[PDB]
Design a protein around this ligand. Structure first.
Ligand SMILES: [Mg+2]
Ligand SMILES: [Mg+2]
Lengths: 310, 310
């Protein structure tokens, strides 16, 4: 009897579910239909998180671990959960909130997190992680920070990492759709979030974009996700049972209360629309509108085209 | 008719409202009754944000601005909203989410956020901000980054700042209770969030702590706030009208479903308890509990003592 709903927050005050950044656009990208299989920002409408998705905004694209010495003054990290609690293999693709970009270097800023180690001195370690590296092994709980500054960190130092920025590999552009390779030890419990395939009825997936310091990107500094983090947090909180084949949303201009566009959000946890032919679809709408639940609908409910025709 | 409620997320998956960090403790601190007047994490039960509080988790203690050249290779920043929207004086204490730590140096890591400036090259600028500096003028929209690296940043470059860590002033310890001096030009619309005075009936204010890289702190690397960010996001979303003098919450083991403690959350937007005398109050309780609304109550409802005797 718990009815379903979405947070009624304006889009442009909601946040990405794959980087800790404000949302400032929504787009569609039908043509370049490469695999859609993000591991963060994944949640069912009844509030089950998938892949590495956490409910915790402050964990999105953060990783934590203890240091050990690797060959050639590389700084090995034994991952734990950001909460500090241990990370064990064979249960999830990677720790909760672990970043899901596989196509470029991560330039990272870490601090120490042990209170005893925080009463004096500089707590910062900086470096970069290469998800294409052979020693990148997040499912089994270990990765390698190339080029650490400082060059020598004591073993067993507890470090919390942020992604300061992302950069392309040499002579490629950084594709933020591409998820990492988590390892080859994939148990059924630890399975990746499934890929999402195009929905039919002339619908196309809607991505919520963020401007983010992603250098040399295929998208010009824009990180897409399928769900605002606030939606994830909302579904996990509400646990509203699924009572239909999809959920029709209206994107409302909040003051004038007029309908700016029709969307469907599917039980698997992704949004779609029908773009007005030959136009940008939802991207031309004001980013200060609000999403409201209208009703459950069937998969074949036909959406009115959204946007202008170019 | 919209009934009041709190997010029913376990405390240790919710986040700080004054730094972007996971919560990992709740404490009381009666005796050292320094003024309680945080500007972030302030929100009424019917969802009116106060001081500099934003709803956007990814804006908590982040600031944005455009560079100009100040004397002696200092880096001046003309503040804007993190969204990019211009910041004007006389309306708010400071931009939304602006950090409210006055008692220590902020060591900051910024990136360029202009997409054209992110097709190539390193986009990082680091430095430190000194709230006690005479050029620290956040209400009027300007501050200075001391010791920038790089030393010369082109004028008018758009930079998004994070606080990597906080450090004490020399010969002092860093008190995270201390809010900045925002300026002298403080109009009525731009008034600070009021300070909170202890509530009577043997009650004391409950603080939600995070471990955070705050070096040399008076609290051993712990940042307190009055409300989890998720609460703020919840009250703003719900807009449930105030229908009593206080709201009684139970803190529930979400397994056993048993009552771990009684709390009141007041309309002005803070939580209290009655510590069992001679103990830490709520600090001994497990941190995986969940808050649930029971009923509105009057101010003189007497809470059962929380915690052990010590
Ligand atoms: Mg899992
Ligand atoms: Mg204001």
């Amino acid at each position: 009897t718990k009815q379903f709903s979405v947070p009624n927050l304006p889009l442009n005050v909601m946040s990405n579910s794959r980087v800790p950044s404000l949302l400032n656009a929504m787009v569609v990208s039908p043509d370049q239909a490469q695999v859609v299989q993000f591991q963060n920002g994944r949640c069912t409408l009844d509030g089950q998180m998938l892949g590495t998705t956490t409910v915790s905004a402050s964990c999105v694209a953060r990783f934590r671990g203890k240091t050990f010495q690797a060959p050639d003054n590389r700084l090995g990290i034994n991952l734990a959960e950001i909460s500090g609690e241990p990370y064990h293999a064979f249960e999830s693709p990677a720790p909760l909130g672990f970043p899901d970009f596989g196509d470029g270097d991560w330039h990272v800023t870490a601090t120490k997190v042990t209170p005893s180690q925080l009463e004096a001195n500089d707590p910062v370690v900086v470096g970069n992680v290469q998800p294409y590296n052979p020693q990148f092994a997040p499912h089994l709980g270990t990765l390698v920070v190339e080029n650490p500054t400082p060059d020598q960190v004591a073993t067993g130092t507890d470090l919390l990492f942020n992604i300061t920025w992302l950069s392309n590999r040499a002579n490629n552009r950084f594709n933020p759709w591409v998820i990492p390779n988590y390892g080859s030890t994939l148990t059924e419990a630890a399975q990746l979030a499934p890929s999402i395939f195009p929905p039919g009825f002339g619908e196309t997936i809607v991505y919520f974009n963020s401007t983010f310091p992603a250098v040399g990107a295929t998208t010009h500094a824009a990180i897409p996700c399928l769900l605002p983090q606030e939606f994830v947090a909302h579904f996990v909180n509400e646990q509203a049972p699924i009572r239909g084949e999809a959920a029709l949303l209206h994107y409302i201009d909040p003051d004038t209360h007029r309908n700016l566009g029709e969307f469907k959000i599917y039980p698997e946890g992704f949004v779609t629309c029908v773009p007005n032919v030959g136009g940008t679809g939802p991207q031309s709408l004001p980013t200060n509108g609000v999403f409201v639940f209208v009703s459950w609908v069937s998969r074949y409910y036909q959406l009115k085209p959204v946007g202008t025709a170019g």
